[PDB]
Design an enzyme around this catalytic site. Structure first.
Site, PDB file in Angstrom:
ATOM      1  NE  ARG A  48      54.670  39.702  53.605  1.00 53.96           N
ATOM      2  CZ  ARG A  48      55.257  40.074  52.964  1.00 53.96           C
ATOM      3  NH1 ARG A  48      55.115  41.193  51.570  1.00 53.96           N
ATOM      4  NH2 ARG A  48      56.731  40.119  52.363  1.00 53.96           N
ATOM      5  CG  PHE A  53      62.365  41.098  58.565  1.00 50.91           C
ATOM      6  CD1 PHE A  53      63.551  40.972  58.374  1.00 50.91           C
ATOM      7  CD2 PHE A  53      61.447  41.076  58.042  1.00 50.91           C
ATOM      8  CE1 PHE A  53      63.838  42.352  57.797  1.00 50.91           C
ATOM      9  CE2 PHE A  53      61.423  42.238  56.918  1.00 50.91           C
ATOM     10  CZ  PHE A  53      62.898  42.666  57.389  1.00 50.91           C
ATOM     11  CD  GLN A  56      52.916  44.138  55.525  1.00 49.12           C
ATOM     12  OE1 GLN A  56      54.098  42.826  55.250  1.00 49.12           O
ATOM     13  NE2 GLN A  56      52.278  44.730  54.230  1.00 49.12           N
ATOM     14  CG  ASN A  95      55.720  51.933  50.435  1.00 47.66           C
ATOM     15  OD1 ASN A  95      55.458  51.708  49.595  1.00 47.66           O
ATOM     16  ND2 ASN A  95      56.414  53.212  50.335  1.00 47.66           N
ATOM     17  CG  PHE A 106      55.381  46.844  58.491  1.00 49.11           C
ATOM     18  CD1 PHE A 106      55.553  47.736  57.647  1.00 49.11           C
ATOM     19  CD2 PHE A 106      57.148  46.246  58.632  1.00 49.11           C
ATOM     20  CE1 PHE A 106      56.533  48.601  57.458  1.00 49.11           C
ATOM     21  CE2 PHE A 106      58.242  47.583  58.186  1.00 49.11           C
ATOM     22  CZ  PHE A 106      58.281  48.023  57.805  1.00 49.11           C
ATOM     23  CG  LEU A 115      64.578  47.388  55.396  1.00 50.78           C
ATOM     24  CD1 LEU A 115      63.626  46.266  56.462  1.00 50.78           C
ATOM     25  CD2 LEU A 115      64.187  47.278  54.109  1.00 50.78           C
ATOM     26  CG  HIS A 119      59.634  51.021  54.316  1.00 50.74           C
ATOM     27  ND1 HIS A 119      58.656  51.127  53.407  1.00 50.74           N
ATOM     28  CD2 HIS A 119      60.202  49.761  54.122  1.00 50.74           C
ATOM     29  CE1 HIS A 119      59.063  49.922  52.506  1.00 50.74           C
ATOM     30  NE2 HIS A 119      60.569  49.119  52.970  1.00 50.74           N
TER      31      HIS A 119
END
Ligand SMILES: [Zn+2]
Ligand SMILES: [Zn+2]
Ligand SMILES: [Zn+2]
Lengths: 159, 16, 130, 28, 286
Positions: A48, A53, A56, A95, A106, A115, A119
């Site tokens: 990903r 942003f 990943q 996650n 990532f 966030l 995480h």
């Protein structure tokens, strides 16, 4: 349990030295030390990839599901009240939700403060910030999947 | 942006 | 095929860069549109139940993974306790009595089903608007 | 629980008397 | 020229029934902009409501992410130029009959054949949203859109239908306030409605309110979040994070940058997923 912070990761784009933070989360660092020692990533592709942003990867399938730990298939999130998701180049554990961690990972590209309470902030790149900015410009679809192979050549938990 | 998206492969030279 | 493969969740911070609508699944620019093979009659029955009385059962497959409620305006469903339109109801209330002439003998007096019922300042504003 | 134990039978053998009644297996 | 399978249709046009029955033609009317023969669809939204068929083609809906019959935004439920000014880009389209009109519709259809999933150019700037448009995105919509339009012969008092006149009655419309981009009459009033909200009065002094009582920190705001949201504004003179009330105190040197914070946070600064708590500080040596 060792803590020389450099990680000699060898990727298809290039060799990147990654500073692990054994100061703040030694558990996830030991788990990835054990797994990259056993070579979970020698030949794994990033899955990903979003512009500005996150990047990943760590999926052996590349399909957003693969991952296995030493503490079961899933293990625990850890935090720190001064490491927050604030900046680019911030390596972290990929996650689903808390009390759960897969083997994927990532990095981020911006101050992403909402966030921080979720995480595990797992590392940061020192040599190769232009490398991760170059990797951050791979074209991906709306399903966020790459075009050609961008695959980890070889992993080394250096230390 | 105004400009295009610049693509080079992971190993070799600049892709056109 | 295995349950664990498709039921496996997605790793990530869910990508909140998008809006709610573009992050939502689709195939058609407005929602995932897919065929179906419902019974005609129960479709029509619960459709007419909502169209008359403002409540019906909800159609789903994977909303909560369990869904067995009523929708629309809720309380009038349990006022009638879940009856339908094809049922001879518990009471015959607020009926409205028509007058019947079903002889076909009198002329201009026979109204069969065509019976009109027993029940049978603004213009200043309307003239100033026009 | 009290009269629903036969009101569900009313609805079921009401509905099923139209579910398959009119020879679904008027045309011309 | 155009077939379809299912229409676009924002939620207020479907009506309040989850079970609606809808009919389709194969080449129905023409599009009311580009005269293209789409497939007109018709249904009944509700039991007191007109039929509201289908107004533009699927192509002229995929251009501006617009619903199929009421011509509003598919993401919001808003008019067109509200979205394009609120996203500051217009995504131009000609006005005449051929002059680049059916040419550009034909070619933008030809380069839209692959996806069929998202609008053609709005996809990049429909992400950076939800700040200036989300304050006016009227959810739980009013169904007065679907009510049948006003009949004549009640306007002239002649309507022999009596009760069974399906359309309406006793709604005389007013001839003072009733296309696709500009200009539209109620939209000017709605942008005046957003430019003229109800704030707190601006008190009669010379910009002394550089402090402000912003709070509701809870466990969401931290110290570096709010002072890096103010570091882009500029420099502090004294911060504190007073956690007995879950509040934060910031000021500016020569107020102006924190001035837009007063414009950013009239119950409006939405970071970390919370309607923040804001009332006025002292700036009075109290
Ligand atoms: Zn059209
Ligand atoms: Zn509409
Ligand atoms: Zn009338």
């Amino acid at each position: 349990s060792w803590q020389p912070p450099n990680v000699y990761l060898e990727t298809s784009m290039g060799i990147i030295v990654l500073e692990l933070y054994w100061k703040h989360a030694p558990k996830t660092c030991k788990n990835f030390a054990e797994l990259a020692r056993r070579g979970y990533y020698n030949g794994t592709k990033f899955h990903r990839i979003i512009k500005d942003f996150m990047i990943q990867g760590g999926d052996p399938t590349g399909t957003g599901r693969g991952g296995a730990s030493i503490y079961g298939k899933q293990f625990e999130d850890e935090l720190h009240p001064d490491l927050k998701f604030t900046g680019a180049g911030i390596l972290a554990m990929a996650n689903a939700g808390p009390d759960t961690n897969g083997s994927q990972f990532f990095v981020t590209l911006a101050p992403t403060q909402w966030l921080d309470g979720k995480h595990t902030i797992f590392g940061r790149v020192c040599q190769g910030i232009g490398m991760v900015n170059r990797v951050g410009m791979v074209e991906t679809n709306s399903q966020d999947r790459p075009v050609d192979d961008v695959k980890i050549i070889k992993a080394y938990p250096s230390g | 942006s105004n400009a295009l998206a610049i693509q080079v492969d992971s190993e070799g030279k600049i892709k056109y | 095929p295995t349950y664990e493969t498709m039921f496996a969740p997605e790793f990530g911070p869910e990508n909140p860069f998008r809006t709610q609508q573009m992050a939502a699944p689709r195939n058609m620019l407005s929602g995932y549109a897919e065929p179906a093979h419902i019974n005609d009659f129960m479709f029509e029955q619960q459709r007419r139940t909502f169209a008359t009385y403002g409540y019906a059962l909800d159609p789903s497959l994977d909303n909560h993974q369990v869904s067995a409620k009523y929708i629309g305006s809720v309380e009038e469903a349990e006022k009638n306790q879940g009856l339908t339109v094809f049922e001879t109801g518990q009471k015959k209330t607020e009926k409205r009595k028509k007058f019947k002439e079903n002889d076909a003998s009198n002329i201009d007096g026979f109204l069969g089903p065509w019976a009109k019922y027993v029940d049978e300042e603004e213009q200043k504003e309307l003239d100033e608007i026009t | 629980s009290e009269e629903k134990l036969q009101e569900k039978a009313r609805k079921w053998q009401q509905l099923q008397a139209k579910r398959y009644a009119e020879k679904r297996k008027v045309d011309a | 020229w155009e077939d379809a399978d299912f229409p676009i249709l924002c939620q207020t046009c479907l009506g309040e029934n989850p079970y609606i029955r809808m009919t389709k033609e194969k080449y129905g009317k023409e599009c009311k902009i580009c005269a293209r023969p789409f497939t007109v669809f018709r249904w009944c939204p509700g039991v007191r409501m007109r039929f509201k068929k289908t107004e533009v083609c699927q192509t002229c809906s995929k251009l501006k992410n617009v619903c199929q019959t009421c011509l509003l935004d598919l993401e919001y439920g808003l008019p067109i130029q509200v979205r394009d000014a609120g996203l500051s880009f217009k995504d131009d389209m000609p006005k005449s009959d051929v002059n680049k009109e059916y040419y550009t519709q034909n070619m933008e259809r030809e380069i839209s054949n692959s996806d069929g999933t998202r609008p053609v150019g709005m996809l990049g700037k429909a992400t950076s949203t939800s700040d200036m448009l989300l304050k006016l995105a009227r959810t739980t919509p009013y169904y007065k859109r679907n009510r049948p339009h006003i009949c004549s012969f009640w306007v002239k008092g002649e309507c022999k239908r009596g009760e069974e006149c399906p359309y309406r009655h006793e709604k005389p419309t007013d001839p003072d306030d009733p296309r696709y981009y500009g200009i539209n009459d109620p939209v000017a009033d709605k942008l005046l409605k957003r430019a003229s909200t109800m704030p707190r009065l601006d008190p009669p002094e010379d910009k002394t309110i550089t402090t402000l009582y912003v709070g509701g920190l809870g466990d969401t705001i931290t110290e570096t979040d709010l002072r890096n949201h103010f570091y882009q504004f500029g420099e502090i003179r004294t911060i504190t994070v007073v956690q007995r009330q879950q509040c934060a105190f910031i000021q500016f040197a020569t107020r102006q940058a924190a001035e837009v914070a007063a414009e950013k946070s009239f119950n409006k600064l939405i970071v970390n997923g919370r309607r923040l708590n804001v009332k006025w500080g002292r700036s009075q040596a109290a």
